[PDB]
Ligand binder design. Structure first.
Ligand SMILES: Nc1cnc2n[nH]cc2c1
Length: 165
């Protein structure tokens, strides 16, 4: 199971870790991807997870988009987890660098409540442009299921833990 996590609340845990490396080690039932509406896994967590699947995640995603069209900002879809997890929950947090409504971050986190336990990154953090301290606050106040947060950057991890109310 998950190891080396700091408990933040009854159901939220956090660790300074590469989510690709965490997923390969634990092989969780669900790994969350920081997806965009087109499931174009170019950079950030999405690019890293996709590269770990040898592009199989992108091939599957393109077939999903061809059939279903794009996701909504705040929405999600469950696809295969490939070599990383049983499933990948592709969740679209608002991208602040695209002028997307930050209030959609709570809607994005609500998707996590459909899964008993998840390995996840902070939604809308990193290249999505939102304040990661705000993302962690929305996470703890929205997610009721067990969420194991992987924060890649050590310096951001320390800031998140030390400022956690
Ligand atoms: N917050 C995270 C977690 N794992 C990551 N792997 N590559 C980029 C990442 C960002």
């Amino acid at each position: 199971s998950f190891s080396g996590y700091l408990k933040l609340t009854d159901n939220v845990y956090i660790k300074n870790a590469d989510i690709v490396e965490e997923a390969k080690k634990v092989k969780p039932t669900v790994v969350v991807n920081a997806a965009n509406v087109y499931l174009k896994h170019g950079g950030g967590v999405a690019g890293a997870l996709n590269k770990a699947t040898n592009n199989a995640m992108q091939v599957e995603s393109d077939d999903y988009i061809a059939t279903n069209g794009p996701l909504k900002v705040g929405g999600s879809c469950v696809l295969s987890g490939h070599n990383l997890a049983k499933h990948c929950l592709h969740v679209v947090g608002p991208n602040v660098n695209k002028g997307e409504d930050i209030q959609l971050l709570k809607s994005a986190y609500e998707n996590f409540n459909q899964h008993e336990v998840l390995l996840a990154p902070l939604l809308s953090a990193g290249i999505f442009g939102a304040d990661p301290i705000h993302s962690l606050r929305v996470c703890v106040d929205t997610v009721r299921t067990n969420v194991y947060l992987a924060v890649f950057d050590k310096n951001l991890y320390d800031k998140l833990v030390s400022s956690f109310l």
